[PDB]
């Protein structure tokens, strides 16, 4: 449940994001550098549990959806659909900070 | 969590219910007298989880929609969208009984 490269290979995008989005590439730079606990906390926040399904994280078919422009509001989640609701933050540093704060609340 | 006042403050109503409907005010009297276990069972039944979101239960944006007339069927829910489907039961005691049976056996 730590192979986040397998997570990226199957992730799709919504709300205006594509795999070539600046925000999206910043995001994958961040989570690939996450620790093992931060990866599990991300899976719990986005999917509802830290356990990988059988077949690897690719079967989650995660979606990263842009839900707005730059803001101070934290990212939210839609666990039913494994969707991260991710505002288009103005920096990689802000994105990491807002994303970490959102997923460490548990 | 147990902050059901914040849940009531952001709840929306449809299908013929409003905040002034008799059964709606009876609903809130019932759940506000719920035990801590029954509150968590209600959240798990209505939202899919008993954990409070980041920002309290007010962020759930619960919807109570009218689902048919008086009946002995139980209330249902769409946990992917925090929607409570509630038939217009004939009394508060019946509503309490039907809602308790629904959340304890699911």
């Amino acid at each position: 449940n730590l192979d986040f490269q397998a997570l990226e290979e199957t992730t799709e995008y919504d709300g205006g994001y594509t795999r070539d989005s600046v925000l999206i590439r910043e995001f994958w730079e961040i989570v690939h550098s996450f620790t093992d606990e931060q990866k599990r906390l991300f899976l719990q926040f986005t999917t509802g549990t830290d356990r990988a399904p059988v077949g690897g994280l690719g079967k989650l078919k995660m979606i990263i959806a842009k839900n707005g422009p730059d803001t101070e509001r934290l990212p939210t989640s839609h666990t039913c659909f494994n969707v991260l609701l991710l505002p288009e933050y103005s920096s990689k540093e802000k994105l990491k900070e807002r994303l970490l704060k959102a997923i460490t609340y548990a | 969590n147990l902050d059901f006042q914040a849940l009531e403050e952001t709840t929306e109503y449809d299908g013929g219910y409003t905040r002034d409907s008799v059964l709606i005010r009876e609903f809130w009297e019932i759940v506000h007298s719920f035990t801590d276990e029954q509150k968590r069972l209600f959240l798990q039944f209505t939202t899919g989880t008993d954990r409070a979101p980041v920002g309290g239960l007010g962020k759930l944006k619960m919807i109570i929609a009218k689902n048919g007339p008086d009946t002995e069927r139980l209330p249902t829910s769409h946990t992917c969208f925090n929607v409570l489907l509630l038939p217009e039961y004939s009394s508060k005691e019946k509503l309490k009984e039907r809602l308790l049976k629904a959340i304890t056996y699911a």
């Binding site: 919504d14 979606i63 659909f81 969707v83 | -």
Partner: peptide, 14 residues
């Protein structure tokens, strides 16, 4: 049933 919104991923996984 947000099919309550116009998100394309709900229409893709419904």
């Amino acid at each position: 049933x947000x099919x309550x919104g116009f998100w394309r991923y709900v229409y893709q996984k419904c």
